[PDB]
């Protein structure tokens, strides 16, 4: 039995005095009315902030953390088993409509990996060379200067 | 109140105390080419023109100090918080 189904006989259906549930006055105005006066509480302040750049000048990067790669190496049997080597561009999902692929250094690297990507970070590098591994920058990756 | 035209104080640019010269900020002219100037033309037409139909506000009994502190050596200026003053006159 629902709350609704128990209202017959209550007269007010939970509204308190029958002088309550009338029009927009019981709401303090239609929609967002009074967002700076009587109902300013818990409303983001009035104002203009910052600027936007034209969408066709914006770039969307494809990210991936080392932890993800390293945790699935033994399962990624369909990828080169060097002295491990994996072209990152083939691992990441959503790599089609992306401007490039970048490897981030989050997590551990318990293997000797030879990574191929368009861009890396310090932590990504240090952790790969920390496990006696290399990092190979792609031709697109040659855009660093 | 009176105020010395030149005195020693911290220059946030050199990062060491130096002699600054005090001047009153003059109003820079309007180019009339900012976004607000364009919206006035676009949005104004037949009948009332919203905000662009309003007229100048009013006046406070006393305005704060609008000054420019210029460093004697590096020559750059910095701004400071003002204080209500009925009149300001520099000494020398």
């Amino acid at each position: 039995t629902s709350k609704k189904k128990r209202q017959r006989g209550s007269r007010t259906h939970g509204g308190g005095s029958h002088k309550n549930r009338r029009g927009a006055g019981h709401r303090g105005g239609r929609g967002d009315a009074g967002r700076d006066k009587h109902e300013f509480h818990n409303h983001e302040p009035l104002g203009k902030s910052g600027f936007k750049r034209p969408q066709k000048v914006q770039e969307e990067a494809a990210t991936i953390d080392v932890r993800e790669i390293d945790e699935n190496v033994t399962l990624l049997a369909a990828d080169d088993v060097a002295e491990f080597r994996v072209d990152v561009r083939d691992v990441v999902e959503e790599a089609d409509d992306a401007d490039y692929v970048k490897v981030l250094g989050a997590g551990q690297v318990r293997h000797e990996l030879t990574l191929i990507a368009d861009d890396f970070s310090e932590g990504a590098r240090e952790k790969v060379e920390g496990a006696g591994g290399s990092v190979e920058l792609t031709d697109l990756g040659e855009e660093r200067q | 109140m009176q105020m010395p035209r030149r005195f020693n104080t911290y220059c946030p640019h050199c990062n060491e105390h130096q002699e600054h010269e005090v001047e009153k900020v003059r109003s820079g002219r309007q180019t009339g080419m900012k976004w607000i100037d364009r919206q006035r033309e676009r949005n104004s037409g037949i009948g009332n023109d919203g905000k662009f139909s309003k007229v100048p506000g009013g006046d406070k009994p006393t305005k704060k100090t609008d000054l420019k502190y210029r460093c004697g050596e590096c020559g750059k200026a910095h701004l400071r918080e003002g204080w209500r003053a009925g009149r300001l006159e520099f000494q020398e």
Partner: protein
């Protein structure tokens, strides 16, 4: 070599210069004394006519139509209106003078259909255009592989529905890309927003 037609065209690039200038000064005097719709035997600008569809044939008609210059002839509000809608003077109509002339002509010839039109000048208070009309019932046209299409039922009263050339342009259908989001495939379908 240049066609003889290319010369009529060139003179009309500058209706204020040369002989055409003197010609226009003379003509308009007789024009101002004529009606609103005057059927004429030969087009004033041969090159433009033929370019638009004209043909020296049975069932092809032409008519000069004068319309007044200026904005809308509107009556001031008689009941309550917010300031935005109390205008009279700066209000103009959304249909252009050339499209107005085309209509006043098609009504004079209730059996014919508008093919196209062009401008033939104006003075200080009126504009003249020459509409080209076609008899959809004459067999000379019904067998013309160039003009027969204007015989179909769906071409009936084509001017009043904006299917004319000047019509389609005034409806903002020129551009095929940017700026034509609310105009194509029709103004009415896009909630009337252009």
């Amino acid at each position: 070599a240049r066609s003889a037609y290319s010369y009529i065209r060139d003179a009309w690039e500058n209706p204020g210069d040369g002989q055409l200038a003197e010609l226009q000064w003379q003509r308009q005097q007789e024009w101002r004394n004529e009606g609103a719709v005057e059927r004429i035997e030969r087009p004033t600008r041969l090159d433009k006519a033929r370019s638009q569809g004209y043909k020296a044939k049975q069932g092809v008609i032409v008519a000069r139509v004068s319309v007044r210059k200026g904005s809308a002839r509107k009556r001031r509000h008689k009941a309550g209106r917010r300031s935005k809608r109390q205008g009279v003077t700066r209000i103009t109509r959304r249909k252009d003078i050339q499209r107005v002339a085309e209509e006043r002509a098609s009504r004079t010839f209730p059996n014919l259909r508008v093919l196209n039109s062009y401008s033939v000048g104006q003075d200080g208070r009126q504009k003249w255009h020459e509409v080209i009309l076609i008899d959809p019932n004459h067999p000379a046209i019904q067998n013309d592989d160039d003009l027969s299409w204007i015989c179909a039922d769906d071409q009936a009263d084509r001017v009043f529905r904006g299917l004319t050339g000047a019509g389609r342009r005034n409806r903002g259908l020129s551009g095929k890309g940017k700026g034509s989001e609310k105009t194509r495939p029709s103004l009415r379908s896009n909630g009337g927003k252009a």
